[PDB]
Amino acid sequence: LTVKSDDVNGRTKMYKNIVDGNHQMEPGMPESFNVLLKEIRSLGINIELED
Amino acid sequence: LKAQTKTEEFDAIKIALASPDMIRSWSFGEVKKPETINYRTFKPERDGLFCARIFGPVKDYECLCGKYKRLKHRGVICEKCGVEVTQTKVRRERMGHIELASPTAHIWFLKSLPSRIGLLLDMPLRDIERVLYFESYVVIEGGMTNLERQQILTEEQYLDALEEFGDEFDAKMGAEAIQALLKSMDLEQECEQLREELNETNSETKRKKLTKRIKLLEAFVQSGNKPEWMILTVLPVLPPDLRPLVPLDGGRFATSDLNDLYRRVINRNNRLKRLLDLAAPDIIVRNEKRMLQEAVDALLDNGRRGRAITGSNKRPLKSLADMIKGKQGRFRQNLLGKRVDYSGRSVITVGPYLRLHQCGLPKKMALELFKPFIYGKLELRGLATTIKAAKKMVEREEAVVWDILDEVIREHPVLLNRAPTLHRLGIQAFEPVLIEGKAIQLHPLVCAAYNADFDGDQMAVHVPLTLEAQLEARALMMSTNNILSPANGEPIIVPSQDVVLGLYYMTRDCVNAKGEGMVLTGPKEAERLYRSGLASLHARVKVRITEYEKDANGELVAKTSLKDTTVGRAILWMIVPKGLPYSIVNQALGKKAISKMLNTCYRILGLKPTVIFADQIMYTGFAYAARSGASVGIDDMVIPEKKHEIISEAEAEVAEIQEQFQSGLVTAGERYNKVIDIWAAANDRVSKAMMDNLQTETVINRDGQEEKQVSFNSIYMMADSGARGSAAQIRQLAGMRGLMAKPDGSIIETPITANFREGLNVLQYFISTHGARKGLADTALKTANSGYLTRRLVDVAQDLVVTEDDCGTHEGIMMTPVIEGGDVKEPLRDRVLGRVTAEDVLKPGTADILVPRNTLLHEQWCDLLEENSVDAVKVRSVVSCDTDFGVCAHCYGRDLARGHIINKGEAIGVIAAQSIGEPGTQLTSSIQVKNKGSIKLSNVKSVVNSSGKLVITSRNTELKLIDEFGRTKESYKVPYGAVLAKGDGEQVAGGETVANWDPHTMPVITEVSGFVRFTDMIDGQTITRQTDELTGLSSLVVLDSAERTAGGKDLRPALKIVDAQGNDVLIPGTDMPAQYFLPGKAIVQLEDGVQISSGDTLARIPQTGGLPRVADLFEARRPKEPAILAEISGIVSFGKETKGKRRLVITPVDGSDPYEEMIPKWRQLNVFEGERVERGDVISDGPEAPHDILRLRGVHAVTRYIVNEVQDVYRLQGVKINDKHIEVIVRQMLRKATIVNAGSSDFLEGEQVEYSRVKIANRELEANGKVGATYSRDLLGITKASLATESFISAASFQETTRVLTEAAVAGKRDELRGLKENVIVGRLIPAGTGYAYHQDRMRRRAAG
Amino acid sequence: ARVTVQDAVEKIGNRFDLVLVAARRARQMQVGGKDPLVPEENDKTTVIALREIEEGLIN
Predict the structure, then answer these.
(1) Scanning B388, B399, B672, B1205, which has its CA 20 to 30 A from the CA of B640?
(2) Which residues of chain C lie closer than 8 angstroms to A22, CB-CB?
(3) Residue C59 C-alpha, separation from nearest chain B C-alpha, in angstroms
């Protein structure tokens, strides 16, 4: 419910991936999630990821 | 392993205040113009939201100006307007900037009820409001002028403030001004002064503010986020690929009008910067401050100011709040997010041939679900031309790809699930089998696990794509592995019924037997006798079963033996694996027999034997079910002519009893229950007929003329196997149903006269209709509330993870058999099943350890604790666990679907939740014992009186039944004052009154012998003369002190107990003066000078349990009339009458004497003021408060009290669930605690217990001796625990996200993604389970290495 | 015959670290990095790594 069937690009990245047959992936910030960051980045509380 | 040098992953995650300089770090260009089109040609505006210099590439590796197209171009820009030829996919990551000028304040954090800006500045929010709407000049950088820092000034008055203060003073208005104040907010100067007032002001109106103010201020110290960053300077621009541009085909815009919103934001942005250039007046540039402010608002939730409509349209501006607050936070995690791929929602069907490890999947479904894997295969090998031709092959249904279909399924396991499933046992895995059809088949007996019949169970069978999930299916999710319930260590699947009647017909005894006497040497030729047809499957054959037993170190010892067995049992050996002995399978086999049968094969031989054994059973169960033949018989359902006879009596009898009514002997009500009475007896007598009829009536010839056997009557076979035919269901078809509930809920005196098998009428029917419709309503509601119950349940336990194995404490609690009423309700063994002994436990023999401290108590050790005479075992509890922020494997145990040590990564939190809410749908005189033991009086002063009898002087009275065996069996709670026949150490008979009291009179008795003298008792002002014309006994009845006179109210009548001379006698046992202060309405039985005995009756004082009730326990709802707990051990006296209450003055002996309780005399008190009540003694009656049981009695006391009670609810349900889960939930409700000692944080802060646990940890150690704050455990409700969430990721989900916005945004609460829920919304492995070692490498790679 | 993995949980007891180990070995097997050493019989690679757990040469 994130990487699969949620990340509009993530499952196509998975389609283009499994039509080869090699299950191997990376974490999945659901992009709209990156808009959550962006909305409060617009307010003042600038969330980051240090180190 | 070492922390890897290369970037493999990223790490824990935080939130707090950063810098616009960080926004400059993402800066790729500045959006100048809001226009996205030319108004002429619809081409994409450069220097706009769709700029090439700022953003760029629309085509893969593209220079938008139109110079570099080829994908050879990487990084080279359009020197004129910088277009780095890169991925348009990277254009979903292009962030820009626009230099503001208009200070953007936080109107959100102002209008927020939880006034962020308010108590931040320690300035009233109302006046702060006046400041930001620009109508009040606030004083900044002030102080010692006429005005202070926390103050406003109206327009013209500040003009006067100029004519009065042209120097050393400044007061501007708005965020501009407030930024000046944030620039000067010195945390620690205020910190000194706060703790100053902490010692100065002593009111909660002043110091509560104090405690969280200092808290929030050092919270900014805690995160290093300065209030200065609350004024927006540079605005971040969302990537173009994120606010989609799609005009409507024709000439309109179907675009995300978020662009039409940022459009105005950019318009007004450049506007105020222009009002800097031309220098416009302040009142209007600050008017633009408000203007760019609503721009901000319009984007979010239109603020909370009102949702201003769009251009001449009934339509508020668009809301990204309605983009970050819909359901469960966002809409993946909300209801309706996703719709599973690689799955199939399809109806079900049996398939009695399916191996225990496999399910059935339709061929058509197969094609549709595995195509990508089919193409992945067709070109990894290369049997297909192209993937397009591959599609054309399945287009032609070509046999080739069906063989490649075999390659993608024959060892590729699947997961299964149903929609109505609320339990984890409803999500399992099997192996696929290619069945040509449309319905998902299954292994018959597993349906009971899903609790899925054949009424329309549509299952969505999932497909584990990744390597991980495939193994995880065959691992923990394999059917053949979760053969145990996480609730109790019993095999979850019990052979249904078809299977059992087949084997009831296997191992079976019938008197007429063909071959009854022959002998065999092999169960295999046994096959050749019945499966051929020459012998019966019941003949008493003597066979040599060379059974085996793994008595060795793993070797099955060879032991020869011959049994007088039946043909079917010999064939049953062909089923039973050697390791399992023939003795257990030399039994008729019932549903319960075969239950524990499979369980023994597990505890003894193992899992593998048992699994493939039950597999064997399934096939042969149904196999001989067919071979059974005998199925049903009308000739069996014979009604005895005894039924018709007793009904004849049941007619004549009540006909006479109705004549007793026409005579006036029995009343309507007494005859009401009387009808009940004799029909009850009549039904039991008819029962005594129909059951014996159906038990011995099959009498077939054998070595004589006739000889009985258990009824071969099929209905009785279901009553013997206990499959689906019970003594009451039998009584309801072939006998009179019994008495039924009426539409009111009570009971109609008249039963259902005849029997359903024969005939009744609609009136009888309406009585029965009530009951049927009854059950129906129940299912119809219970289901919905169960999910909602587990909802609040997960809302309280989710993040609890076992993180250690052994802690470092001996502390645990006491496991005891709740021997109540008669014999024990819940024994010792089942509570201990799956835990570890607290300390080195002794035997009744002292200092002889029968179980060392740290030892896992499993099957054998549980058998061990049942052999010893030990009855009370202290076991390490999950609440007494020394491990903070989790539990140790030991305090938990092993019991689950597994039976091994609980893992570090196994989140017990969530599984506790579901397994306590799983049975949610299910939740809705004298004392003469009939056994043989001995009275062992406990905690009571019993005294001998005349005639050498015995009495009881207290209410606290447990009656024990120490058998000749020794085990305490029966336990009766005997009332105040009774007639005992035995003392402590005198044996009981079978049906003997050992305690005989009066249920309608509470006698107060003397303990000594002597004359009674009425003292401070006058006839008419304290007592009354009630020597009626009906009685002859002289007696002065003590009235209550509210009906008396003026000068009468001031007393408590005293019954003086003098000796044979006339002097106050001292009590043998307690140094107390004999002056019994009597209560009201107590009818005495004597005159003056009457010598009482030592234990004689002086006076006479005439007198849901289900789901909702459990909901009460867990919502901590304070009941109406609590049985007030005595807070201290001490002697008690009384005080004050009618006014509003009746004071209770308690005088502690060695503690604080000011302990007194105001109690309404309107409430029934029972406190003997001559008895020194203890700290844990009920003063009044009715349900008590667990809160006081928690503090006044103890946490381990209350945790054990409630687990007793709620488990009893499961006793009304008969379900046995291990309290481990219910106790972690108790720990959850006590995770916060009201601080008592000041010094470190507060003097009353409801704060996390484990948080303060580490405080005091390094408080008695480093830097201090003792100054830290110490708590008192505070217990909460789960809907308040769910409300007291810290991490915003989980809070924003169910609580109002906007609430959560404020709630953690201003504090910048850096929660490093330490919880499960958090991990899932970001789509990353939790630091537990399979992500354990994953994040292990990740955690020591974060802030360490 | 394989139907239960009682054997597997005995070796790598956390029941989830099992998932980790076998999964990665399965992929080295996928990629011609290597090939199976313990004889396979059509088993997908997850199952083959599990054979190396019961034999005990790989964990």
Answers:
(1) B672
(2) 27, 30-31
(3) 14
